[PDB]
């Protein structure tokens, strides 16, 4: 269970990190190491060199400007879950982070590492896409941007190309009131299904809705059918239930030792219905 051999570098600048990766195609980036080291322990990957981003200070920056929250790739789950700016701008973020692993892991894990790892059951890839965030990626050719949805293409599959570095994520401050929840064997456990609901109400009537499901399929599922159904309706138990059915119909979860396809769908429906009601509650009051 020992890591295979590799060299190590921790450059002081983003530009240098890019140069190292460009010069050595077999080199790989290491951020918090909470997802990469387990893979190394199993010898599932054989990097020639690990390039640490610990010394690239710009990647640790958190700032807000003109309605948008900017979070650097090396910002840990801990900082994101406790930072004042993040809390005031995007309160749904720290609430979602409460579900990510445990304290020890959140002390090293980063937003960028989580997004680049792209586990289909991870909270961040799901949340960023759902919040309509934008990722900024740097390479030898410059900096480019891509939407969070386009960034996350599948399980362990991102829009990232060889030699590229995720620098930061820009999150538009939401107008919708968001609530999140998920089903996990034990709090902290990788979720079988997760759901987020963002609502806007005019009195007791919904005027805007964004329902999304994660960990059910390889990418976040924006439940358009549900969104359109909730618009113009009073959100009560029966309505939330119907929206939940609309949000899960068409989904194709995979059966494994932790749950069959049917169980997954049943859970997806239950969790979605729950979060919708919770969102409507917070939105109105």
């Amino acid at each position: 269970m020992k890591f295979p051999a590799f060299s190590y570098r921790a450059p002081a600048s983003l530009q240098e990190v890019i140069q190292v990766l460009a010069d050595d195609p077999d080199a790989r980036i290491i951020a918090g190491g909470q997802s990469l080291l387990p893979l190394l322990a199993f010898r599932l990957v054989y990097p020639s060199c690990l390039v640490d981003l610990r010394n690239v200070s710009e990647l640790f920056e958190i700032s807000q400007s003109a309605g948008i929250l900017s979070v650097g790739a090396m910002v840990t789950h801990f900082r994101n879950k406790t930072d004042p700016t993040v809390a005031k701008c995007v309160p749904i973020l720290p609430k979602v982070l409460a579900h990510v692993a445990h304290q020890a892991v959140r002390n090293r894990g980063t937003l960028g590492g989580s997004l680049a790892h792209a586990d289909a059951g991870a909270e961040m890839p799901f949340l960023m896409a759902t919040l309509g965030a934008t990722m900024y990626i740097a390479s030898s050719a410059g900096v480019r941007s891509v939407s969070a949805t386009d960034f996350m293409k599948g399980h362990y599959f991102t829009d990232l190309e060889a030699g590229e570095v995720l620098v930061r994520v820009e999150i538009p401050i939401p107008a919708l009131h968001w609530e999140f929840d998920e089903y996990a064997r034990r709090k902290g456990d990788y979720a079988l299904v997760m759901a987020a609901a963002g609502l806007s109400m005019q009195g007791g009537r919904c005027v805007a809705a964004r329902i999304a499901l994660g960990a059910v399929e390889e990418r976040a599922h924006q439940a358009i059918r549900a969104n359109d159904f909730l618009v113009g309706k009073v959100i009560d138990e029966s309505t939330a239930a119907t929206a939940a059915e609309l949000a899960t119909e068409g989904l194709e979860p995979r059966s494994d030792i932790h749950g069959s396809r049917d169980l997954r769908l049943s859970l997806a429906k239950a969790i979605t219905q729950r979060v919708i009601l919770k969102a409507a509650q917070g939105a109105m009051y």
Binding site: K2, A5, F6, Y8, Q34, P38, A41, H102, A104
Partner: protein, 162 residues
């Protein structure tokens, strides 16, 4: 050379050790520095047996490269006792029988100190929540919760001696 010079403070003392990048911090502390108190139960970050404090924060040493300890202040179980006496938290573990085989204990203490540092008298529920990342196969957990919430532990924590 395949070895890298790493400078870090361990249990209050500046140390210099040589390690290859392929070695995680747990192994480095145990085999290079010679502090076997830190235990390894999975090397996957799940069991928490290797939990230590890095710059005051609990982290999995099996998921931390030894080379990443550069410039950090590490605290392992060996640094807890002051003089030749168990500190308040350790003594409470003993009084409440919070350990049997003792393999998970080093990690338990690390997480526990982290909790008490932020809150001298946490509720049993808060303790069970934060301690959920540390596995124990012998005790059933209850006595660990008892030890952490013991009044002598709370008093020591308030005086900053946990």
């Amino acid at each position: 050379s395949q070895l890298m010079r790493i400078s870090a403070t361990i249990n209050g003392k500046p140390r210099v050790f040589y390690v290859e990048p392929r070695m995680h911090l747990a192994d480095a502390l145990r085999e290079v520095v010679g502090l076997t108190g830190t235990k390894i139960g999975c090397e996957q970050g799940v069991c928490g047996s290797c939990t230590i404090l890095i710059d005051g924060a609990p982290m999995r040493s099996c998921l931390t490269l030894a080379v990443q300890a550069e410039g950090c202040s590490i605290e392992t179980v060996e640094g807890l006792s002051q003089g030749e006496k168990l500190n308040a938290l350790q003594d409470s573990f003993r009084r409440h029988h919070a350990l049997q085989c003792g393999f998970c204990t080093a990690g338990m203490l690390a997480t526990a100190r982290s909790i008490l540092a932020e809150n001298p008298a946490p509720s049993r529920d808060e303790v069970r929540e934060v301690m959920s990342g540390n596995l124990c196969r012998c005790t059933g957990y209850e006595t660990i919760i008892d030890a952490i919430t013991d009044p002598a532990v709370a008093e020591a924590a308030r005086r900053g001696e946990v």
